[PDB]
Amino acid sequence: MSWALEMADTFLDNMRVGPRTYADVRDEINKRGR
């Protein structure tokens, strides 16, 4: 149970103003590779 902590962690991890779309964030893993 806890206070939804396990979720709060993954939240601050991806707390980038929430998601917006997949075509965009996805194309980022193309020109921004390694």
Technique behind the model: NMR
**Residue 19, both tokens:** 């998601």
Number of domains comprising the chain: 1
Q: Could you write out the three-class secondary structure of the chain?
A: CCCCHHHHHHHHHCCCCCCCCHHHHHHHHHHCCC
d(CA 1, CA 18): 24
Query: Taking the CA of residue 1 as centre, how many other CA atoms within 13 Å lie in the half-sphere pointing to its CB?
Result: 0
Boundaries of domain holding 1: 1-34
Query: Taking the CA of residue 21 as centre, how many other CA atoms within 13 Å lie in the half-sphere pointing to its CB?
Result: 4
Question: For tokens 């149970």, what's the residue?
Answer: 1
Contact 19, 25 (CB under 8 A): yes
- Identify the CA nearest to 11 among candidates 28, 26, 3: 3
Measure Cα distances from 32 to 14, 22, 25, 28, 29 in Å.
Answer: 18, 15, 10, 6, 5
